[PDB]
Amino acid sequence: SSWWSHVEMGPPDPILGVTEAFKRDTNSKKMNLGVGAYRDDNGKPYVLNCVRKAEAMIAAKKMDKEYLPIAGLADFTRASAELALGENSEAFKSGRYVTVQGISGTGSLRVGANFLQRFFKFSRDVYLPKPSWGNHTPIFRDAGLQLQAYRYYDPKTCSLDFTGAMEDISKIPEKSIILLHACAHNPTGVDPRQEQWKELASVVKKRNLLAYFDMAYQGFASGDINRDAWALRHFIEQGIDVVLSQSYAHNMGLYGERAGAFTVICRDAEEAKRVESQLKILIRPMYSNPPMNGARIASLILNTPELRKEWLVEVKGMADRIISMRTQLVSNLKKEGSSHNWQHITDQIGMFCFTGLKPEQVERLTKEFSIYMTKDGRISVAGVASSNVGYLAHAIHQVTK
Amino acid sequence: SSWWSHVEMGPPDPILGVTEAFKRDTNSKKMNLGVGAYRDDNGKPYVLNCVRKAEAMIAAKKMDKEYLPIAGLADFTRASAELALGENSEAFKSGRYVTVQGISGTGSLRVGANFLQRFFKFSRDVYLPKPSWGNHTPIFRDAGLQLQAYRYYDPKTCSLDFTGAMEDISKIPEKSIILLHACAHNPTGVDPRQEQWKELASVVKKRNLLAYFDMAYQGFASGDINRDAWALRHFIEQGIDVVLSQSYAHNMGLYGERAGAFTVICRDAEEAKRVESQLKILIRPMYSNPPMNGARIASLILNTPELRKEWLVEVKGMADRIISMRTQLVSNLKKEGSSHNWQHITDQIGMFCFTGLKPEQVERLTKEFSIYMTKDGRISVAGVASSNVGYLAHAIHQVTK
Ligand SMILES: Cc1[nH+]cc(COP(=O)(O)O)c(CN[C@@H](CCC(=O)O)C(=O)O)c1O
Ligand SMILES: Cc1[nH+]cc(COP(=O)(O)O)c(CN[C@@H](CCC(=O)O)C(=O)O)c1O
């Protein structure tokens, strides 16, 4: 009986733990369809061309590694704001925003969570969509806020239950906080339609709710970055001052370098200044200043015309491939003779498919075929390659037959 | 009256803010002696040779950027443990430790702070030495613990007030938490003597206090890394199970890449396993997984014999230079005709000198000479170069005359 005799065995992360389990299997045909990580058509980690050139630029310049200001790389901070808001945006033009480099999406989310905990005097409730990325709970819960829920997904119909959402949302207490996924909702792969978004705006505005946008997949919903930032831009434009978290982990394939940002849209550039002051203060006693590599790479691509353009081509490339894989998946299922309707697989967008498989099926999949996915039936289509869509489909079928 | 009408202008970080102020001065002779950042003899940011080769190795291998496990790079985690504990260590050999990659020193410190908040059921008090790095307060305070103090520095005598420390320490309530700087105490540059450390061990052990070591400057106290880890090793060896935070920001000049680690010494490898589980759980909803670059670079140097050896030469090189600058500083002061005893400047170790200048003098220094330092009179000798020790000394003198 020492200091930690009492500390119990905590369980493995529902998402990140799949990769740990996957790592150990000896099956040569194994597939890691758990975390949303882009794999190229060979089924290999893919580092974009533009990322590769960004890094070379950095190398060549023989840059130092001195500490970055607490808020991050100005150039990256400003270009991230700009990427979300759009260059024409009044918010951006007027400087009514504060963007701070964050430790990827998760890092940004928690900074905001912490910021709200401290400065959002109107409420302690955060409404998450049913269902949501498992991690939104703990992120909010550890920061000190309460979690609530709003209906979103209709499993019966494999789509968004708009009526349920609107009902739930029209009733959230005023001045509460609502978390919205900007695009490629995780894990359903179903976003509201633009008409739909417009109706949500109204209710949010009307109920005077703080809209918190989680934008982890800008460019993976349509394959177009501006198109994917529509909702977000629409709300700001309707006069809704949101807070936002951005991740460059998927769209730039910067996973491990941890590049991201957290933004608050304020009333004036002077409020923006005061909020920045306080955000610095929160970040300081947390990690002091942020990791420079991801931010340097992203800044160079973003601010370098030829780089940026290459990047957009590369993003289309990625989404495209994901599409082909959905398609094929479905085809192979029919080929295999599957009786089930697998239309949701091609209807869903972003990196995954919310399959509907029950936990007994998931289990079999891992054990008989060594195909790893989250227990909720969510699979990452992002990680399928031409060489194993066949295998995937056959398995799905066997376990479903 | 929007959401953030109430959020007030927070002040600039007492340490990091000096660099912000410094950045704006137009004086061509300006000197940034605030943050502890190594400058080469030309007064330029210095990226070690071995760091440069580590990066080239990485480049050459065309490594991916997939996400690292929540606890960090195994290789880096294990080599950090090893760097602190020493290779012969029973703790290490036996695997009674858990080391987790942290976002530099600050990142590691806060992870531990958070861990204790959650699992240290014996107390909410953390005793810091008087004085300490300004940031220890907020780090502990934001995590949820209470701050206490123990006497350390004797300004009258420009040294460690051992009697006061021992008195204060012999009285801290049992099972409390005491933060100790492993070496190169920040900001006094005065460490306990080995005899002294031995006496501290006893009292800590006797009072059954949780010893929390902050090891930010391993190699900057003596210019020898094992020598600098003595105290730390001695406590573990006396049967004191510490928690520790390591930073590679100064000794490897990795400032902005944010590489560091947090370790807990446990009873067995099985407790170690349970603690790891819980640490993962804490990190997950905080930043998810850590920045890979700093960790990849540090892992390669540490685990690469020729790299490691080069690294130790480079560390000696750095400490040496710091020594020369102290020396010279003092010489120039006499040359200038300073009446004061400046012996503390050469007596102090690590990257700074706790000068004793009053705030009015600090102020003049910045305004007449554009020499930036923290308001407490702490200056970073680390950043002085042969070309400006003269200027420095003349200024000090003018403002002191
Ligand atoms: C909605 C969502 N929001 C934020 C993030 C933040 O990611 P990062 O920048 O790494 O902090 C992720 C990653 N979630 C995918 C990646 C694995 C993970 O969970 O992490 C996933 O759901 O598989 C999200 O899916
Ligand atoms: C005692 C101490 N502990 C931990 C750290 C953590 O540093 P990092 O790995 O960057 O998180 C520092 C840096 N403190 C010097 C560097 C500037 C800073 O304060 O940050 C300093 O005191 O100037 C310390 O001086």
PDB file of N, CA and C in Angstrom, chain B residues 215-251:
ATOM      1  N   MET B 215      12.571  18.643 -13.640  1.00  0.00           N
ATOM      2  CA  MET B 215      13.887  18.518 -14.275  1.00  0.00           C
ATOM      3  C   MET B 215      13.879  19.080 -15.697  1.00  0.00           C
ATOM      4  N   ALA B 216      14.029  20.386 -15.737  1.00  0.00           N
ATOM      5  CA  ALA B 216      14.069  21.148 -16.980  1.00  0.00           C
ATOM      6  C   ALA B 216      15.478  21.366 -17.509  1.00  0.00           C
ATOM      7  N   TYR B 217      16.494  21.368 -16.626  1.00  0.00           N
ATOM      8  CA  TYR B 217      17.845  21.635 -17.145  1.00  0.00           C
ATOM      9  C   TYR B 217      18.867  20.535 -16.984  1.00  0.00           C
ATOM     10  N   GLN B 218      18.540  19.279 -17.151  1.00  0.00           N
ATOM     11  CA  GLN B 218      19.557  18.202 -16.971  1.00  0.00           C
ATOM     12  C   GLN B 218      20.691  18.478 -17.966  1.00  0.00           C
ATOM     13  N   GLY B 219      21.879  18.706 -17.460  1.00  0.00           N
ATOM     14  CA  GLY B 219      23.134  18.993 -18.093  1.00  0.00           C
ATOM     15  C   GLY B 219      23.603  20.441 -17.989  1.00  0.00           C
ATOM     16  N   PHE B 220      22.786  21.309 -17.410  1.00  0.00           N
ATOM     17  CA  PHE B 220      23.137  22.748 -17.347  1.00  0.00           C
ATOM     18  C   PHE B 220      23.632  23.258 -16.010  1.00  0.00           C
ATOM     19  N   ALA B 221      23.589  22.313 -15.089  1.00  0.00           N
ATOM     20  CA  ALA B 221      24.046  22.641 -13.741  1.00  0.00           C
ATOM     21  C   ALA B 221      25.548  22.389 -13.647  1.00  0.00           C
ATOM     22  N   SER B 222      26.026  21.243 -14.103  1.00  0.00           N
ATOM     23  CA  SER B 222      27.468  20.922 -13.990  1.00  0.00           C
ATOM     24  C   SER B 222      28.151  20.767 -15.343  1.00  0.00           C
ATOM     25  N   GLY B 223      27.317  20.469 -16.311  1.00  0.00           N
ATOM     26  CA  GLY B 223      27.661  20.265 -17.722  1.00  0.00           C
ATOM     27  C   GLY B 223      27.752  18.770 -17.980  1.00  0.00           C
ATOM     28  N   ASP B 224      27.349  18.041 -16.956  1.00  0.00           N
ATOM     29  CA  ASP B 224      27.364  16.569 -16.949  1.00  0.00           C
ATOM     30  C   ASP B 224      25.947  16.087 -16.699  1.00  0.00           C
ATOM     31  N   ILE B 225      25.380  15.270 -17.557  1.00  0.00           N
ATOM     32  CA  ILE B 225      24.001  14.822 -17.319  1.00  0.00           C
ATOM     33  C   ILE B 225      23.818  13.877 -16.157  1.00  0.00           C
ATOM     34  N   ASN B 226      24.717  12.932 -15.939  1.00  0.00           N
ATOM     35  CA  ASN B 226      24.497  11.979 -14.797  1.00  0.00           C
ATOM     36  C   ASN B 226      24.663  12.770 -13.518  1.00  0.00           C
ATOM     37  N   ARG B 227      25.745  13.584 -13.546  1.00  0.00           N
ATOM     38  CA  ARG B 227      25.962  14.384 -12.311  1.00  0.00           C
ATOM     39  C   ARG B 227      24.715  15.178 -11.911  1.00  0.00           C
ATOM     40  N   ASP B 228      24.066  15.802 -12.887  1.00  0.00           N
ATOM     41  CA  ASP B 228      22.874  16.624 -12.677  1.00  0.00           C
ATOM     42  C   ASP B 228      21.672  15.811 -12.212  1.00  0.00           C
ATOM     43  N   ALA B 229      21.631  14.532 -12.548  1.00  0.00           N
ATOM     44  CA  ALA B 229      20.497  13.689 -12.107  1.00  0.00           C
ATOM     45  C   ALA B 229      20.728  13.034 -10.762  1.00  0.00           C
ATOM     46  N   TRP B 230      21.821  13.361 -10.080  1.00  0.00           N
ATOM     47  CA  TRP B 230      22.137  12.758  -8.772  1.00  0.00           C
ATOM     48  C   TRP B 230      21.031  12.746  -7.725  1.00  0.00           C
ATOM     49  N   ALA B 231      20.597  13.940  -7.349  1.00  0.00           N
ATOM     50  CA  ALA B 231      19.560  14.099  -6.300  1.00  0.00           C
ATOM     51  C   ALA B 231      18.411  13.153  -6.553  1.00  0.00           C
ATOM     52  N   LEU B 232      17.855  13.303  -7.740  1.00  0.00           N
ATOM     53  CA  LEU B 232      16.744  12.538  -8.248  1.00  0.00           C
ATOM     54  C   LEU B 232      16.945  11.040  -8.030  1.00  0.00           C
ATOM     55  N   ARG B 233      18.141  10.601  -8.406  1.00  0.00           N
ATOM     56  CA  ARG B 233      18.494   9.170  -8.282  1.00  0.00           C
ATOM     57  C   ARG B 233      18.676   8.718  -6.839  1.00  0.00           C
ATOM     58  N   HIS B 234      19.230   9.681  -6.103  1.00  0.00           N
ATOM     59  CA  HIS B 234      19.447   9.433  -4.662  1.00  0.00           C
ATOM     60  C   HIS B 234      18.107   9.200  -3.978  1.00  0.00           C
ATOM     61  N   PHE B 235      17.113  10.062  -4.180  1.00  0.00           N
ATOM     62  CA  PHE B 235      15.779   9.886  -3.548  1.00  0.00           C
ATOM     63  C   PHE B 235      15.111   8.550  -3.840  1.00  0.00           C
ATOM     64  N   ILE B 236      15.103   8.176  -5.118  1.00  0.00           N
ATOM     65  CA  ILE B 236      14.493   6.911  -5.553  1.00  0.00           C
ATOM     66  C   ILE B 236      15.137   5.736  -4.833  1.00  0.00           C
ATOM     67  N   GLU B 237      16.447   5.790  -4.790  1.00  0.00           N
ATOM     68  CA  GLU B 237      17.381   4.876  -4.149  1.00  0.00           C
ATOM     69  C   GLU B 237      17.210   4.837  -2.624  1.00  0.00           C
ATOM     70  N   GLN B 238      16.793   5.935  -2.002  1.00  0.00           N
ATOM     71  CA  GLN B 238      16.518   5.965  -0.557  1.00  0.00           C
ATOM     72  C   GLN B 238      15.111   5.390  -0.316  1.00  0.00           C
ATOM     73  N   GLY B 239      14.399   5.018  -1.364  1.00  0.00           N
ATOM     74  CA  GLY B 239      13.058   4.437  -1.319  1.00  0.00           C
ATOM     75  C   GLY B 239      11.921   5.421  -1.431  1.00  0.00           C
ATOM     76  N   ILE B 240      12.219   6.572  -2.001  1.00  0.00           N
ATOM     77  CA  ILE B 240      11.256   7.664  -2.220  1.00  0.00           C
ATOM     78  C   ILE B 240      10.828   7.480  -3.689  1.00  0.00           C
ATOM     79  N   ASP B 241       9.554   7.266  -3.867  1.00  0.00           N
ATOM     80  CA  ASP B 241       8.889   7.076  -5.155  1.00  0.00           C
ATOM     81  C   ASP B 241       8.386   8.474  -5.543  1.00  0.00           C
ATOM     82  N   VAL B 242       9.094   9.094  -6.467  1.00  0.00           N
ATOM     83  CA  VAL B 242       8.752  10.428  -6.953  1.00  0.00           C
ATOM     84  C   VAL B 242       7.901  10.372  -8.223  1.00  0.00           C
ATOM     85  N   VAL B 243       7.543  11.594  -8.600  1.00  0.00           N
ATOM     86  CA  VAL B 243       6.816  11.786  -9.892  1.00  0.00           C
ATOM     87  C   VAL B 243       7.825  12.774 -10.506  1.00  0.00           C
ATOM     88  N   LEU B 244       7.935  12.743 -11.821  1.00  0.00           N
ATOM     89  CA  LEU B 244       8.938  13.687 -12.383  1.00  0.00           C
ATOM     90  C   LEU B 244       8.511  14.271 -13.724  1.00  0.00           C
ATOM     91  N   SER B 245       8.947  15.521 -13.932  1.00  0.00           N
ATOM     92  CA  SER B 245       8.644  16.082 -15.261  1.00  0.00           C
ATOM     93  C   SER B 245      10.000  16.423 -15.934  1.00  0.00           C
ATOM     94  N   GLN B 246      10.167  16.058 -17.187  1.00  0.00           N
ATOM     95  CA  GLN B 246      11.392  16.341 -17.936  1.00  0.00           C
ATOM     96  C   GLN B 246      11.021  17.209 -19.157  1.00  0.00           C
ATOM     97  N   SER B 247      11.910  18.101 -19.516  1.00  0.00           N
ATOM     98  CA  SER B 247      11.873  18.991 -20.651  1.00  0.00           C
ATOM     99  C   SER B 247      13.198  18.792 -21.445  1.00  0.00           C
ATOM    100  N   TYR B 248      13.094  18.804 -22.767  1.00  0.00           N
ATOM    101  CA  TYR B 248      14.256  18.694 -23.650  1.00  0.00           C
ATOM    102  C   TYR B 248      14.377  20.032 -24.395  1.00  0.00           C
ATOM    103  N   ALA B 249      13.670  21.039 -23.901  1.00  0.00           N
ATOM    104  CA  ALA B 249      13.713  22.350 -24.561  1.00  0.00           C
ATOM    105  C   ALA B 249      15.078  23.006 -24.508  1.00  0.00           C
ATOM    106  N   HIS B 250      15.754  22.940 -23.363  1.00  0.00           N
ATOM    107  CA  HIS B 250      17.090  23.614 -23.322  1.00  0.00           C
ATOM    108  C   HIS B 250      18.259  22.725 -23.668  1.00  0.00           C
ATOM    109  N   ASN B 251      18.341  21.566 -22.996  1.00  0.00           N
ATOM    110  CA  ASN B 251      19.470  20.649 -23.222  1.00  0.00           C
ATOM    111  C   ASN B 251      19.537  20.159 -24.667  1.00  0.00           C
TER     112      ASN B 251
END
